[PDB]
């Protein structure tokens, strides 16, 4: 629905929607910007990620509320409404995955952009895996794993251990291991090794980069504290 708006106006409006906490608008504006067919800048990739993370985050929180009510109960209303929210969430994940496939990932040549999009791909398959129960559930889990793994391989070859996207990717892959793949030891090992190798690289950073990296290291430590 955004084809008649200028790319720069879509970007401007996405920033306004973020300030207004109108994340569904924000996501639609950024979807329109992606569909212009040009690659996304660092800041623009951030806007895309923030928009859809907020949208799906609200759907995931609602799905978890309804799922717990449904479990406590087990007429059809709780199941029906959980299924409605679940279908809406799957639609948003499919939309994001479609933007990544057409054609963000194939046009992403630099390590920073390619790792960013593969992390997104892993995240949205992870969100699909959280609600999955059928024939394709193992394939959904393996799609998340495969996206995260490729992003990790690139990030380890091409980025310093303190790079925020490398740190965030390792954080989320470790959550995938703990929550989705039932591999808590892998989750813990990944979080520890990521934290320790980042610690040893902080000395190379400016004060502003140091602030960015240690913020994400604290999330790794929070999980390690929760898990051990």
């Amino acid at each position: 629905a955004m084809g008649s708006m200028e790319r720069a106006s879509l970007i401007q409006k996405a920033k306004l929607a973020e300030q207004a906490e109108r994340y569904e608008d924000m996501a639609a504006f950024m979807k329109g910007a992606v569909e212009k067919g040009e690659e996304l800048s660092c800041e623009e990739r951030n806007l895309l990620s923030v928009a859809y993370k907020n949208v799906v985050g609200g759907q995931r929180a609602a799905w978890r509320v309804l799922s717990s009510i449904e479990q406590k109960s087990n007429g059809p209303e709780v199941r029906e409404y959980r299924e409605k929210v679940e279908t809406e969430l799957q639609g948003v994940c499919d939309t994001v995955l479609g933007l990544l496939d057409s054609h963000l990932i194939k046009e992403a040549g630099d390590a920073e952009s390619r790792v960013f999009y593969l992390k997104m791909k892993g995240d949205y398959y992870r969100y699909l895996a959280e609600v999955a129960t059928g024939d394709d559930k193992k394939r959904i889990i393996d799609s998340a794993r495969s996206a995260y793994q490729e992003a990790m391989d690139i990030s380890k070859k091409e980025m310093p251990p303190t790079n925020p996207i490398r740190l965030g990717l390792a954080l989320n892959f470790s959550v995938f291991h703990y929550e989705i793949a039932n591999s808590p030891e892998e989750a813990i090992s990944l979080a520890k090794t990521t934290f320790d190798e980042a610690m040893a690289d902080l000395h190379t950073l400016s004060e502003d980069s140091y602030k960015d990296s240690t913020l994400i290291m604290q999330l790794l430590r929070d999980n390690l504290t929760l898990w051990t």
Partner: peptide, 7 residues
């Protein structure tokens, strides 16, 4: 329960 990346 665990933290994934967030701003």
């Amino acid at each position: 329960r665990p933290s994934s990346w967030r701003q």
